[PDB]
Amino acid sequence: ATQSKPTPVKPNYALKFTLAGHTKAVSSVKFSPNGEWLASSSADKLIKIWGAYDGKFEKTISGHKLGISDVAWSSDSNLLVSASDDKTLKIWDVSSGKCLKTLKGHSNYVFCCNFNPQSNLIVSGSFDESVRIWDVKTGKCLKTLPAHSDPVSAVHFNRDGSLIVSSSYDGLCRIWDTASGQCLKTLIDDDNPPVSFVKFSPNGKYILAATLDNTLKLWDYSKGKCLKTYTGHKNEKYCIFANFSVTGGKWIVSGSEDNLVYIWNLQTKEIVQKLQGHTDVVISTACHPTENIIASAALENDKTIKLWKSDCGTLEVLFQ
């Protein structure tokens, strides 16, 4: 038997740290896979690295010519890739802060990026409606996918790196075979609101999608069926990341345009907590890989990142 954190009926996340230092809107925050670092990207063209447990500022990574919309870690936590309004991605060596490769090909802003699990590949999506697969070791573009007819808002590899899921303002989610670039599947709903975010579940079987109609949906990937819907927050404008939280119970976590962090019971769809303290739109949230820690970041009128932790929670107790 292994040590697995308790699964309460409702978590109890409390604010522990607030991290100030970006000078413009923060666009994304991500925990390193080894659990030691938190990376943030911002419209001020900077990446900042912070300690995951204490929020202590570690270093600033610079060189992009315009603002950054996304950042993503390699699997060994040694590299980062960023996507910038300057139409490039850059690969960084985290310990030294040096740009190893600039990936150019996109015709407009790069909005989203991710390493594949093996971390020899990078996928990216652009305002230019395309999805690109890049070679990390050489920095050349392997494929360009004619993915969508509007900006691409998110791209993500599944658990074994054989599939990429993409989303776009055109209202579509598509799944691509990495090896061939073939579109294997297009997800369409009764209606086609812009899709502002998508990602695979940790086991690769479901995809979680955000639409600009204040809705999160969990889709069965094989069947192309929507299995769960999550509402109650505000998301009509911004590309707000959403997360699977799995260290404590099984929750969906997302930011919101009403300045709060929302947490849903994955299975029942009920809101189980709303974290208050941010003072502007919560644009990005992320969940620590092993601890019950949530990082949240907010837009220009706030500009801070918050670390929340839940060690306890509500338990149901049968008296008899």
Partner: peptide
């Protein structure tokens, strides 16, 4: 009803 979604299980 209410089949329990398992999003972490490796099958």
């Amino acid at each position: 009803d209410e089949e329990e979604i398992d999003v972490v299980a490796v099958e």
